[PDB]
Structures are given as C-alpha cells and as structure tokens.
Design a protein around this nucleic acid. Structure first.
Lengths: 82, 82, 19, 60, 129, 71, 132, 206, 218
RNA sequence: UUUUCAUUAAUCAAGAACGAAAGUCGGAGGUUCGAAGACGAUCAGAUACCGUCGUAGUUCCGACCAUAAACGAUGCCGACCGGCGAUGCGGCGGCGUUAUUCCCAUGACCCGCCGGGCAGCUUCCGGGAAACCAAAGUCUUUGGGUUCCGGGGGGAGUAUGGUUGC
C-alpha cells in the first residue's frame, strides 16, 4: 500500500464483500453490488439517498446471499427488528 | 447457517439436541415421587430405573425395569420433583 | 501367454529340476 | 538479515560501503546498505582503466 | 484417540473461516489454546471469544472476522533458537511484511517479533496469517 | 503415514537407510556386484589385443553393417 | 412423398402476416395474388407457396397458428388480456382458515378479524404417498 | 419496512393475501427458507409468515426503486401461470418483460439482436427458469425471486417467501410488488386505494 | 471505425470511464478488445508463446488445426494470455491476440524487505494450479531478477515484476498448462488478503448506475 | 443410565488365534455332480467347446496345508466441513385407526426427534491426470498419532541359502 516516502503505490484498492469480508476479485463475474433505497420517515418516498451492499461469487453460489442481504438490512435498520 | 448464536441457542432446540452434544451437559432423566394406592408412605424413584423397587409400606411392586424409562404399576401416580 | 499358465509352467520346471 | 543494532552488521556494512565509495560506484548521499542491491554491471565496467583512458580523451 | 488438542482447535477455526461462518465452536479448552487465541486477537485476526465453562473441560465460541487466511499447528513442538528463527519465519510465513509464528518460551506464549524483542528462544506451537 | 515424533530419529534413519536399496542407481553403485561384472572394472579406458574384425547389423528401422573389432 | 422446404414455408408465412386480408380459401385466387405480391423466380415455386398459403388460410379460422402476427386476433387477445370481473375474485363472503394460521395472524395483532372463520383441523395424520 | 407506521401492512392487505391462499406453502422445506416458515401442520403443508413476506416485498420494492431508468429493471416468467402478471407489471412499472421461452445467451451473447444488459432481474419461480438465474452469474446482475417453501436459493439475492402454484397468489404478489414500487416512487398515493384490481394480474386458462 | 455493442463500450467511446482500474474495481465483464486498445494500446506488446499442431482422426486421414498461445502486457502491472485453435496460423494468432487483450488483469506488486521507492516483487508467496502443474511465486530481494524457466519469465516480465523466486511442480513440458498455471498465479495477487487491505471499503457509484443519464441518449 | 474404577489409551518388530475352494494322510459312507480316463459327434486337424458313461474328489469324524480378483483392487484411531428422502436396531415425545371385548397397557400402523450401523440421491465445500470421491476433501496457505509398503519396463517372485511341511 504505502512505502516509507508516504504516497500510495497501487493501481486500485479492491472492494471487500459486505457479508464475508473477502476481496471481490477483478474477474469475479458472479459478484453483485446492490443499491437499496432510503424512504422519507413521514411520507415513505424515495428521498434520493441509498445504501450499497456488495456480495462475492462464493456467497452468491452457496445461496447465503439472501440471509447476508437480510441480516445487513436488519443491522442497517432497513428491515424492522423482529 | 452463517449467523447462529452458538452462545444462546433457543431452549426447544437445546432439549431436542443429544444430551452429550448440548452446549452445557444435562441429563434427560429426573427424580419423581410415587403415591401408591394402598399406602400412605411416600417414596422417591429414578425416571429410568433399573431395579424393581419395592414399597416396604404395603410390600407391592412400584416400577418395572425396561429398555428406557421404568413403567409404573396401574394406580400408583407419579409427580415431578423440582 | 496368460500369467496363471506362466506360473504353472514355472512349477512343472521346478519339479523336474529338484528331481 | 541481521538486526539494525548489531555491532558486526554495523562494522562490516560501513567497511563494505567505504570500499564501494572508495572504488567509485556510489556517492556520500547514497551510502546506505539497501542501495548496494541497486548497482549493476555498467557501474563496475565504467571504472576499468581502459574505459577511463577513453573517457578522459587520452585515446580516441 | 485425540492427541495435541491445539491441532483440532486450529484446524476447526481454519475450516470455519474457509466456509465463511461468523462463529466457530472449539472443544475442549486449555490454557495453551486461550493464550494462542489471545495472541491471534491482540494482532486483530479473530476478535472477541467466550469460554463456555462446564465442570469437565471448557468449550470456546470464537467470533470470526474475514481476515485470517491460514492458522496452522507445528507437531511435534520443535526446539527453536534465535539463530534458527530466520529459517522458520523464512519457511512458514507468506511475506516478511505480515504473519506470525507463536513460540512457547520461559517468558510465555508469544509471537516471533516479541521473541526477538525480549531475546529468548522456545518451542514452536503454530503459525497464523 | 510417516512418524513425526521427537524420538523417531532411529525409525526414520533405519527406514530411509534400507529403502535406498530399492533405488536402481544406489544398489548398482554401493553393492560391489556391478564392478566385478564390468569388463573394465571401474576404469574409464582399457587396453586390449584385437582378435578379429566383425560386421554388426543395425536395429530393425534402418539397415547398415556397423564395422567392429573383437578385442 | 413430398414435404414443403424451409423456402416455401418462410415465404408463405411472411406473405400471410403481411397480406392476411388479401388472401382467402381458394387456391387459384392465392396463386394469382402471389404473382402481384412477390417477385418470385418460377411458376412451380409460386404454385407450391400459393398451395401452402391456401393450407395455412384453412387452419387460421380453426385456431391461432404459432408465430404468425395476423394483427386481427391480437386485438381480441389484448381484449382477453385486458378483462376484469365487476366483483373481485378475492372478495369471498367468509374466508375458511385453519387454526395455526389464526394463531399466526393473532401474533401479528390481527386477532380482531371477524370475516375469518376457523374450521376444525383434520383428525387423521397421513399425507405422504405410499412408497413402494 | 423501516419499522414506520406508514409502511406497516393493513387488514385489507392480509385479507387480500389469505383470499388467494399465499399462506399455503408446499409439502417440502429447503434449509435456507426455514427462517421465513411459521409452523408445520398435519396434511404435510408448511405455512409462510406474512409479516416476513411483507418485509421481503418492501426490501424488493426498495431495491427496484433504487434504479433510475425503469427500462433497466427486467422481469421473467417461464410457466403459463405468471405470464399475464409480468406483461401487466411491465405496463405499469415500465420494466422490460420476457414471457415464455427464455433464449440461452440472452444476457451473455453480445452479437444476438435480442441481446440485453439489464441492471436487475425479478423471477417468477427460480426452479422453473434456472437459465436466466444461471446467466445472471456471468454479468454481475442482482436477482429477486418469489420463492416457495421448497426452492433452490443459488443466485437469489432477495427471496420473497410466498405460494407459487396458486394462479391467484402469483398475480396478487406481482400486483402487490407493482403497487409497492409505484407507491414508493411517488406516482400513486397511500391515502387512495390503487384503481387497478388484482384480477387484472391473474391468469385466464382456456 | 469501431461502433460498440455493450453499454461499457459506448461509455468508453464517450470518454466517460477514465482508467481501466474503474472496470477492475467494479469487476465487470469485458467483451470488446477496443476498450483495452483505448486505454492500453500505446503500451502493449504481444509475444507468441508457441504454435501447437492439434489433430482429429477422420476417415480420410488426420485433420489439422493450429493452437496459438500468445501473451500480451505493458510492463506497468497489466498482463493477459490468449489461446485460439484454427485452420490457419495467422487467423489463430489474430484471434489469440483478441482473447489475450480481453483476458488482461491488473497485477499487484510489493517489496521484499523495507518499503522504499516503487514496488519491484510479488507482495506474498502466491500459487497457481492448472492440470497437474503447480507454479509458486516467492518475493525476491531488489535487483535479483526472475529466477524461473523462459515461459513464466515472459509473463512475469510482461507483468512488470522486476524480481521474483519461482518453484514449479508437475508436467511443465506441457507449455499450455505451465503458461496457464503461472498466469493464474500472477492473477491471484489481488485475491490474496493482506493486513494493509483490512479497512472498511467505501462504496463508489457503479458506472452503469452513475451515467444512466447518457445511456438513455446513446 | 444424576451406577462404578479414574487415564487404565492409540497403533504395532518379535510372538500368537482364525483363515473359502482345491490339495495330502488315516477312518465312515457313496445320492447327485464330476478333474483323470473310455467312447459318440463337430472339424482340414480337436488331444477341446456339444452329448453318453465314469475314477479321485464333492459329504461327515480326527490330523495337516496357510493360499484367492482372500476386492471397497481403498490400513487403523481421532477432529472439522453442505443439504435431501428412505431403511435396520434401541430409546424419547404425540392426534387418530385397528386386535387383546371395554378403561388404561401392550402389539400392528401413522408423524416427528436422538445415537450407532448398510447404503442411496443431489451439490462449483474442496480435491484429482481424469474416471470419479462427501472422501480419494481440510496439500507449496505443504506438520493430529502410528504400522506395513512402491521407486521406468523385462530378467522374476526366477537362482542360490535359510526355515516350515509327509
């Protein structure tokens, strides 16, 4: 990442999976970046703000992308507690 | 899969799972008191018992040795202790 | 030839050799 | 591979660097042991008497 | 039968992390495992863990962060000296930038960098990176 | 499976030592049986007297009379 | 035997879905219109196309032929795909529900619903297909 | 739903759900879908919790409205049951419908005239049309599915648990999604009930 | 002239996407060599690994096609490998070069000891597997060179790895498998997690999601 | 099993028990089948295949012999890692059918659960040269414990020596 000079010496910082915290590879074509919308507290309309989740190929193939999205949505307060 | 609290499993799942493969070990057996129809004296018996037990009060068989839990004689009422 | 018949020839040869 | 505080590494390192500054394939600025790895065959072939006799314009 | 409980513990954690489970159960629990896990936590690989104490021999439940690539045991417990430590950290670790060998020394159970700092050899337990 | 125990040095050494005989090169070398059978007896060159010249035919795929000497 | 080749089939089809209104049941009319419609290479080929056009124009009245955009029946198909009954099919008088569903509802604060009737659960326990 | 009173489901909605019979599951349960199930009953039939069904429908709606161009959002049906429902959805929401036969290489083969690069995929029955879900693995395409009690979850990002075999239920679910998406977007209001009726989204068998 | 068919292609032609690192960040498929020919055309050199004649027995006799193995890369952390079978060597070469451009991946570099100047070696000990052939890359000290066979030396040099230590196991005589193994080994460098890549990633807008406003017009 | 002992264990040079079929000694008996052998066919020839007969043997009792594609061509002990429906033995819980008249209580069913076995289907867990394997996975990100054992193909399981056996 950083040499003793100070400057960052790298092509690009890769995205880590929101679920498993593994590096999403360059040619990870089964990897997903899903945007979930934010509602206005009163009216319940798409204000413009959104919250992004990234899932790697492994978690998609396993079939645990569903529970991973759900539990992230629960944690971030998109899905109601219980 | 992927999110279970190994720390706090639900008590119905705890009871279903094998006595030795529980999170903390506890026996499925229990101690119960027997009230014989032709006697006043009370006796305590093990739920899975191995010996034909006798009530010296009236000199009558109480429970029978079986593959699992000991079958009590007809009339003798069993009640759970603590 | 067949390996079982190689073995049988070898035993016939060992019988005549020893005697 | 030896630690930065070892007397042997210090003494030997300084002696090597001194000799490579003396022969003229480095300068006082770039006089760190790490920079020894950044030399090449050109640097050493430049210091041949043949090369210097040519470079000073005695020979043509 | 079971020999070198640490081997089972580290193998269990390794498989759990490869599969992508957020918690892993280790049984039984010994001081050696607790100290090894403490060293792994201190450098920020596993994080918090709980010692479920039954009277016989404890179990551990370890929260897993997606950081640990590999955590191996070295059996038997080889005798490691300061002069031979370069050879070991050259052989096992993937890079000179990161990774740690856990030695049991007279000082205690600790990583190879602290072993160099405090200047004491010992027995190799395992490695993680 | 290989025994890895701290006190298995004899077992490993014994095994490795006796299993080297199943190597073609080691057995031919160390056992003094190749040397006596070798016509030179472990000498690079050797001197002899000629008996007769002889013409040895080549293998099947290409035919020729290779000139040789019985010595 | 005699099977109509991909050429006469393809040609015949595109002729139907372009000039459905122009064609009819009679072979000779279809034969005569096929001359005016398409520049066609030879008489035999035109006769074979005219014949199979006749054959398709028979079965178009019987039912809708697959992969032929006539444009006529698409209107009444769109009409059949844009139909709604005056009362909603979902609006039953009393909805007959099993107990555990009423349990599932009353745990979500829907226990006050009087439109739902709870029928007694089945007395015999057997649902699986007899194996063997 | 974000635990807000505005996004809580009403009596009419659960009456609409129970009418179609969306709470009637299959006989089999897949290990991933156990979290959505209420309870196993005599007759063999599993029951789906309507609250969690609603939660996943709101999450699906939240995912659909996040996309800017509604043409990007793609909707697929293989079985005859969910054909009309999808063709109606695409008419209201403004999505791209695929109905019946799904051509392999549709999302992958760039040279085909029917080639399409959607940014989302909503599926009817993930068992019935495995091909588009499989193709979604090659193009980084997030996938929403109306899952039954028994269904594989391989390449399914948002799984709405609901009955699929009932012709009313599929149409009703598609209707509810369509309403939720257009409501969330702000084209239609929450005060006035939506003028389109669920039977418009149902299947008419000859 | 080039008229793209993919949305990414139209975005690249309108100078919307700046660098190829953006594509590798969001991990999209690349189905057009002209995208690479845009960003990396100036600095790309390609080398023909071999021309393997492969045959199919038919009633008439043998049938012959040529397998062209070609490696492409600029010496600044960008390498790719193409393989194509065809009737003519030239058609195989051209096709192989197209597949090679399509299959380019970014190569993460690193330091042996203290981190001073630009990175020169592989970051960690990485491995690549292919059909029996194992190839392991190991960090080497500065100005060591590439200690390996010619075939991985091509791809490691074309990846701009200055210094490295290679160890190979299996049938390396099979140049296809050996080249594939070492390429996969290089390709693995970014997939390997290292402590300086532990921080919680910030989610940037996706180029399809970002410039939807332009794709409706073009 | 809310019983007892409290590390007594795992795997194993030497040394042991057992070990199909055939085979060799003595006794008993010999129905069928049947090496050898006698014929009749087929065939250029058939010393075989096909058919009729038939000795030893096949069977039992007491001695030997220690080998089979003795195979899952896959050592044993221990941990972890995906689902699914059956099945065998035991246990645990629960509507309803039936028999022992009826009440329980035992059987036969039915729906779940738990442990140990015989297996099977599915899966991009992951391996492998692949065929395939939930083990043949957890292997260059290489160390749980331990025994036997291979090192290109022939020569050859041959020669010689030892030892076991009539």
């Amino acid at each position: 990442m950083q040499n003793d000079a100070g400057e960052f010496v790298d092509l690009y910082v890769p995205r880590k999976c929101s679920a498993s915290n593994r590096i999403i590879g360059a040619k990870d074509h089964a990897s997903i970046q899903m945007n979930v919308a934010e509602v206005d507290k009163v009216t319940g309309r798409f204000n413009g703000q959104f919250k992004t989740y990234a899932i790697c190929g492994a978690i998609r193939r396993m079939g645990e992308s569903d529970d991973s999205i759900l539990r992230l949505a629960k944690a971030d307060g998109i899905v109601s507690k219980n | 899969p992927l999110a279970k609290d190994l720390l706090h499993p639900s008590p119905e799942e705890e009871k279903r799972k094998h006595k030795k493969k529980r999170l903390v070990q506890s026996p499925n057996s229990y101690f119960m008191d027997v009230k014989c129809p032709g006697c006043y004296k009370i006796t305590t018996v093990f739920s899975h018992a191995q010996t034909v037990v006798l009530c010296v009060g009236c000199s009558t068989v109480l429970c029978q040795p079986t593959g699992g839990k000991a079958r009590l004689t007809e009339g003798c009422s069993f009640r759970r202790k603590q | 030839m067949r390996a079982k018949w190689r073995k049988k020839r070898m035993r016939r040869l060992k019988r005549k050799r020893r005697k | 591979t030896l630690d930065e505080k070892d007397p042997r590494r210090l003494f030997e390192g300084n002696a090597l660097l001194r000799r490579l500054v003396r022969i003229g394939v480095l300068d006082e600025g770039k006089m760190k042991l790490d920079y020894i790895l950044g030399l090449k065959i050109e640097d050493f072939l430049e210091r041949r008497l043949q090369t210097q006799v040519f470079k000073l314009g005695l020979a043509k | 039968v079971r020999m070198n409980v640490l081997a089972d513990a580290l193998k269990s954690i390794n498989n759990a992390e490869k599969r992508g489970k957020r918690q892993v159960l280790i049984r039984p629990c010994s001081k050696v495992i607790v100290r090894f896990l403490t060293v792994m936590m201190k450098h920020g690989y596993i994080g918090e863990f709980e010692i479920i104490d039954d009277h016989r021999a404890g179990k551990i439940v370890v929260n897993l962060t997606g950081r640990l690539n590999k955590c191996g045991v070295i059996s038997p417990r080889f005798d490691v000296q300061l002069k031979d430590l370069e050879k070991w950290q050259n052989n096992l670790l993937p890079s000179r930038q990161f990774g740690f060998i856990v030695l049991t020394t007279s000082a205690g159970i600790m990583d190879h960098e602290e072993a160099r700092r405090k200047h004491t050899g010992g027995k190799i337990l395992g490695f993680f990176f | 499976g290989k025994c890895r125990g701290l006190r298995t040095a004899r077992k490993l050494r014994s095994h490795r030592r006796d299993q080297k005989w199943h190597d073609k090169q080691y057995k031919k070398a160390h056992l003094g049986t190749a040397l006596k059978a070798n016509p030179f007896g472990g000498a690079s060159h050797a001197k002899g007297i000629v008996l007769e010249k002889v013409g040895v035919e080549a293998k099947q795929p290409n035919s020729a009379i290779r000139k040789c000497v019985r010595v | 035997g005699r099977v109509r080749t991909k050429t006469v089939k393809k040609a015949a089809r595109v002729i139907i879905e372009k000039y459905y209104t122009r064609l009819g049941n009679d072979f000779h009319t279809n034969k005569r219109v096929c001359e005016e419609i398409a520049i066609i290479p030879s008489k035999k080929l035109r006769n074979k196309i005219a014949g199979y056009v006749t054959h398709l124009m028979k079965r178009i009245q019987r039912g809708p032929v697959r992969g032929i955009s006539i444009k006529l029946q698409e209107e009444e198909r769109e009409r059949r795909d844009n139909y709604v009954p005056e009362v909603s099919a979902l609006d039953q008088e009393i909805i007959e529900v099993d107990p555990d569903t009423k349990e599932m509802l009353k745990l979500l604060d829907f226990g006050s619903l009087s439109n739902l009737q709870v029928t007694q659960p089945t007395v015999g326990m057997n649902f699986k297909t007899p194996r063997g | 739903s974000g635990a807000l009173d505005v996004l809580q489901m009403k009596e009419e909605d659960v009456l609409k759900f129970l009418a179609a019979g969306t709470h009637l599951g299959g006989t089999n349960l897949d290990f991933q879908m156990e979290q959505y199930i209420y309870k196993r009953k005599s007759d063999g039939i599993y029951i789906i919790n309507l609250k969690r069904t609603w939660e996943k429908l709101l999450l699906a709606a939240r995912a659909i409205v996040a996309i800017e161009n509604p043409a990007d959002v793609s909707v697929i049906s293989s079985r005859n049951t969910g054909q009309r429902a999808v063709l109606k959805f695409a008419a209201a929401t403004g999505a791209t419908p695929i109905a019946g036969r799904f051509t392999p290489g549709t999302f992958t083969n760039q040279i085909q005239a029917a080639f399409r690069e959607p940014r989302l995929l909503v599926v009817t029955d993930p068992r019935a049309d495995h091909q588009p879900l499989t193709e979604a693995s090659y193009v980084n395409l997030p996938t929403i599915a109306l899952c039954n009690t028994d269904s594989p979850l391989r390449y399914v990002d948002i799984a709405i648990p609901c009955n699929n075999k009932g012709a009313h239920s599929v149409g009703l679910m598609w209707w509810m999604l369509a309403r939720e998406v257009l409501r969330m977007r702000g084209t239609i209001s929450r005060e006035h009930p939506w003028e389109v009726m669920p039977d418009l989204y149902f299947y008419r068998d000859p | 002239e080039w008229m793209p068919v993919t949305k990414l292609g139209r975005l690249v032609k309108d100078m919307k996407i700046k660098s190829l690192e953006e594509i590798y960040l969001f991990s999209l498929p690349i189905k057009e060599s002209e995208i690479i020919d845009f960003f990396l055309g100036a600095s790309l050199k390609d080398e023909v690994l071999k021309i393997m004649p492969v045959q199919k027995q038919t009633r008439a006799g043998q049938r012959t096609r040529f397998k062209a193995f070609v490696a492409i890369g600029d010496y600044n952390g960008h390498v790719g490998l193409g393989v194509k079978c065809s009737k003519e060597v030239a058609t195989a070469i051209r096709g192989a070069i197209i597949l090679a451009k399509l299959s380019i991946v970014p190569v993460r570099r690193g330091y042996w000891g203290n981190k001073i100047g630009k990175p020169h070696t592989v970051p960690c000990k990485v491995t690549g597997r292919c059909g029996s052939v194992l190839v392991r890359l190991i960090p080497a000290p500065r100005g060591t060179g590439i200690v390996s066979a010619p075939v991985p030396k091509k791809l490691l040099m074309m990846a701009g790895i200055d210094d490295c230590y290679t160890s190979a196991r299996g049938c390396t005589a099979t140049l296809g498998n050996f080249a594939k193994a070492t390429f996969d080994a290089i390709s693995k460098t970014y997939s390997y997690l290292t402590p300086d890549l532990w921080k919680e990633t910030v989610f940037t807008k996706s180029p399809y999601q970002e410039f939807t406003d332009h794709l409706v017009k073009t």
